[PDB]
């Protein structure tokens, strides 16, 4: 648990924290369960911090009559539907409950029905990127990303990638069932081994200019 | 036969020494502007405002 | 050259000089020369202020040894750039440097290795422009930019252009090798005369509206 190694220098940070100071946008939002959707997700995962969140209706009735007031604005979210809502950040906000077996255990994912942040716009963002080809890959400054839609076919993700995962890709050549995030760009430069089913490497930690 | 220099052969003195600078600076001039004096000036209605009559 | 005309009002502002104040986006880098292009340059130019830059390379590493120390978030950029990577600007930051035949003479370029400041977002910016065709061009409130690329071919290149230079055109009509600046329109109406190769007119200064 403790420190066993020294290291020359520190992490630059961690994922879903600001990392630059500029303009940004945000916006509140509650998660639905992922067993909600209708058509159910081909794709799964938890709501876990620094993974893209889509749309999915409108919360601000508070009622179950005909007659309802409209207390407060509120959006509700998915872990990777359509639509593009925001990226999950700020970890310091919320709270541990730990885990399953005990408390006092490291945990980085949300639960079902919690209040979370979300990113529009933002100078620079830790986030995690996966690769979807398979293949050794470098980022460099001007590449895209794209996430995983909640809907992706098994025909078009043989890999096994997250609902939500962030996917980084070159300008020409792209994954067939992703959805772009408009005017995103990674500006951090970094590369990934080859990856494989039921191998996926994590990824290293990128900085992303949302808008 | 000769033994190759330290230094690369250059001018000695350089042009920041052996110069001379005036005191001061020069501004442009632009127009000069003589409406006070031929009707003058007076303060009578207050900032946020609209109209006068 | 001294004051030899009096004019009734001053001039609204330099290029390379903010005018207006709003949301803003600009990150540090070092130069590369042309030279170090390894499919040779076109189209070449001096650092000059005031010009696209383009993306290079990342140069964090700062070591040889096996454990390597990553003490800093450095990038590197080229005057024609592919990959863009801001407008150099606020010359009040910078030192003359001299100039070949002499020094205190009136110039914006900047040596190699030199540290500068790209703007990516700028509410407004007054930039010196260029015209493409050799002919009279009317640009008005709402038109569009782009920069002469360092791989642009003899062919599309009949007028000598620098190598990162602002050309302005019309919605319709772009000239054929050039790359578009997203999201960044005119402000300021203008009108500049015919051109000839060789005698190509400096354009006047001009608002820009970057992001």
Redo the contacts between chains.
């Keep these: 648990m403790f420190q066993k190694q020294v290291y ?2 520190y992490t ?1 940070g961690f994922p879903g924290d600001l990392i630059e100071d ?2 940004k946008r945000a916006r509140p939002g509650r998660i639905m369960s992922l067993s909600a959707v209708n058509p159910a997700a081909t794709a799964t995962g938890p709501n876990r911090a620094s993974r893209a969140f889509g749309y999915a209706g409108d919360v601000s009735a508070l009622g179950e009559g005909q007659p309802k007031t409209i207390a407060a604005r509120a959006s509700e979210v998915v872990i990777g539907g359509a639509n593009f809502f925001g990226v999950l950040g700020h970890p310091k906000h919320y709270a541990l409950f730990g885990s399953a077996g005990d408390s006092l255990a490291p945990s980085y994912d949300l639960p079902d029905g919690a209040e979370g942040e979300f990113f529009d716009m933002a ?1 620079g963002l830790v986030v995690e990127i996966f690769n979807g080809a398979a293949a050794a890959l470098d980022l ?3 590449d895209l990303v794209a996430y995983v839609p909640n809907n992706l076919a098994t025909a078009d993700d043989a890999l096994g990638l997250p609902a939500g995962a962030l996917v980084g890709f070159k300008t020409g050549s792209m994954p067939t069932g992703l959805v772009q995030i408009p ?1 995103a760009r990674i500006v ?2 970094i590369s990934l081994p080859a990856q494989s089913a039921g191998n996926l490497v994590a990824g290293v930690t990128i900085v992303q200019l949302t808008q | 036969n000769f033994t190759a220099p330290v230094t690369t052969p250059s001018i000695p003195t350089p042009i920041q020494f052996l110069q001379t600078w005036l005191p001061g600076f020069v501004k442009v001039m632009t127009a000069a502007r003589k409406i006070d004096e031929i009707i003058g000036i007076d303060t009578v209605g207050s900032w946020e405002d609209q109209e006068i009559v």
């Design positions: 020359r220098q630059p500029g303009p100078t460099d400054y001007g005017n951090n430069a």
